[PDB]
């Protein structure tokens, strides 16, 4: 279980402190290592701009380019570090470049694949929905907009969440379905932290915006329905009035309005309730590493907690001298990371779609 | 949001949305088949916008030629919902007129002009009442 | 301003004002008694705005029918001081014209049109000079 950094040319194995981070609430996973060498030796394999690949044991966690390298020395100490992110993080700070700023009738996967072509990132689409693949009647790009900004703007309207893979690809991830692990207070927990705050969760989210009238729909849509559009998503956890109104982001129909309203409600649900735990081992119970998007069963019943299943949202691995081997795993309800089509557990078409949705490994008819 | 660069990253999108609300453009293609004129405008650089609707007051109509300068006014600061409010053609505009005038023209003469001392001049070629 | 939600609360109102500066509307009531036309417009949803002034260029006038679509441009991003710059009536617009045209109109024919080859067509019913 050695952390090897496949820098340009050669391997680097021993380290003084390792800190790796991964999450599905982000588009990258950053790593920070601490190196210690005699004063005067050459450190050129670890330079900004090199192509790095972090390999924990025999498995690759991150791949991309090195960002920063700090070197300091005082009268009684000496410290050198190194940092870096994925290759998917190349999109975050780079401005999107395309010839015609407008895509007329394209889907989100095609827009992403056309936008992430010059850099090298590969787009991955995992959802098998019928409504998440609905094409945009028109999608334009604000000039001087980063690829991250454009793709997040599109994914928010679609209800999808965008994430970075463990191999540097872009991923439009799908939440897990089967419970694979168990975290209990008595056996394998060193520290828990359960925060339940209701300062943001509302009761009725209503989204309002403007209809579509550019071009073909301009000969059909009337004057009033251009401005009068609406969508609603209601929560039952908050019992008082507590409403909220959302100005839409783009041209909006009724189904699109309901979709975003549900996306906003589920994101608030995910951000409200949070679990944090510190387990002892980097590896899982089966043997692989701990990574995000994993459905686990929480049995912290000795502390009078009534939650039963949660979905991990952030995993950070640590190799400090005072810590040892630790991984701080953060958890959130699964119902906050779902697409508006699916739900947490009127015809033949509905029955068939329900069957092929319950069984995802089956091939849909499409 | 402690570092200067982090604050810049946090605050840049709002200012970009502000700066990309009002814009200029050049008209390249005009489509009149629709109930609203659909322009094909060209923004800052290497940026086109197809099917941009133009808004004109009730009771007046005009079809500009390609190459006119339009003022695109984005709604809700999105770079979509682009609406062209005014389309000037500086190459074909009447110039050097009296202080108070009001008329209608065409890109080769054809001025229905209202002049100071009660003169409704109608300069055309073949006027046909119906 | 350390938490994500705290930063969202701090930064939301500026973006709300930016997104609400420019807007579309429909026209329901037009009052012409005042020196400037006072519209009664209907904004996004369950929002009315009475006594919204309309601005039109000098030398031209027109009284739109109810149901026209206006572009409300709020001054200083307040949702007050709303001013209607253009009021288009897409239901009564002349369509399929020649590339270079310019002319007044009314919501049932009545076109004073200036056509390509020097033709000042005046299509009306009972023209009365005075």
């Amino acid at each position: 279980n050695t952390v090897t950094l496949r820098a340009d040319g050669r391997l680097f194995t021993g380290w003084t402190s390792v800190s790796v981070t991964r999450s599905i609430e982000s588009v990258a996973g950053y790593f920070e290592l601490g190196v210690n060498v005699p004063p005067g030796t050459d450190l050129s394999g670890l330079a900004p701009g090199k192509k790095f690949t972090l390999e924990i044991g025999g498995q690759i966690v991150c791949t991309g380019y090195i960002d920063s390298r700090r070197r300091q020395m005082t009268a009684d100490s000496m410290k050198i570090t190194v940092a870096g992110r994925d290759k998917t993080a190349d999109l975050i700070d780079c401005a999107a470049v395309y010839s015609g700023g407008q895509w007329k009738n394209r889907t989100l996967e095609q827009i992403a694949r056309d936008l992430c072509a010059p850099y090298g990132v590969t787009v991955r689409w995992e959802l098998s929905d019928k409504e998440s693949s609905a094409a945009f009647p028109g999608f334009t790009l604000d000039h001087s907009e980063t690829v991250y900004e454009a793709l997040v703007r599109a994914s928010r309207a679609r209800g999808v969440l965008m994430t970075s893979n463990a191999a540097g690809e872009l991923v439009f991830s799908r939440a897990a379905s089967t419970a694979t692990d168990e975290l209990v207070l008595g056996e394998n927990l060193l520290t828990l932290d359960f925060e339940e705050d209701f300062r943001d969760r509302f009761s009725e989210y209503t989204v309002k915006g403007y209809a579509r009238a550019n071009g073909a729909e301009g000969d059909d849509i009337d004057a009033k329905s251009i401005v009068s559009r609406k969508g609603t998503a209601t929560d039952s956890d908050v019992t008082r009035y507590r409403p909220m109104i959302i100005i839409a982001d783009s041209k909006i129909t009724a189904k699109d309005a309901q979709a975003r309203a549900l996306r906003e409600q589920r994101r608030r649900l995910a951000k409200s309730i949070t679990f944090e735990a510190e387990i002892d081992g980097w590896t899982r119970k089966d043997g692989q590493l701990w990574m995000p998007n994993l459905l686990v069963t929480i049995d912290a019943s000795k502390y009078a907690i009534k939650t039963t299943e949660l979905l991990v949202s952030k995993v950070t691995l640590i190799l400090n001298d005072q810590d040892g081997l630790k991984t701080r795993v953060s958890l959130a309800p699964r119902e906050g990371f779902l697409v508006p089509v699916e739900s947490d557990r009127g015809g033949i078409d509905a029955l068939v779609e329900d069957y092929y949705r319950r069984h995802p490994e089956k091939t849909p008819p499409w | 949001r402690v570092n200067d660069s982090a604050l810049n990253r946090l605050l840049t999108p709002l200012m970009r949305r502000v700066r990309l609300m009002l814009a200029r453009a050049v008209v390249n293609v005009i489509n009149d088949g629709r109930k609203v004129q659909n322009l094909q405008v060209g923004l800052l650089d290497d940026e086109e916008s197809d099917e941009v609707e133009r808004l004109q007051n009730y009771g007046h109509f005009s079809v500009p030629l390609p190459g006119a300068e339009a003022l695109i006014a984005c709604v809700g600061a999105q770079r979509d919902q682009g609406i062209a409010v005014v389309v000037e053609d500086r190459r074909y505009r009447p110039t050097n007129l009296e202080p108070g005038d009001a008329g209608i023209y065409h890109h080769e003469g054809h001025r229905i002009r209202l002049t100071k001392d009660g003169r409704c001049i109608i300069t055309c070629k073949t006027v046909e009442v119906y | 301003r350390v938490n994500d939600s705290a930063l969202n609360r701090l930064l939301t109102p500026l973006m709300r004002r930016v997104r609400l500066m420019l807007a579309r509307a429909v026209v329901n009531v037009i009052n012409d008694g005042r020196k400037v036309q006072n519209l009664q417009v209907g904004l996004l949803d369950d929002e009315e705005s009475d006594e919204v002034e309309r601005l039109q260029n000098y030398g031209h006038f027109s009284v739109p029918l109810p149901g026209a679509e206006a572009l409300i441009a709020c001054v200083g991003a307040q949702r007050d001081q709303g001013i209607a710059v253009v009021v288009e009536d897409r239901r009564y617009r002349p369509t399929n014209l020649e590339p270079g045209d310019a002319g007044i109109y009314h919501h049932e024919g009545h076109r004073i049109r200036l056509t390509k080859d020097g033709r000042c067509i005046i299509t009306c019913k009972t023209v009365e000079v005075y």
Partner: peptide, 17 residues
Amino acid sequence: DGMGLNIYAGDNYITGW
């Protein structure tokens, strides 16, 4: 820097705008 690193990393849930 707990939040100062989330800006440099991605955020599929927008902080503002």
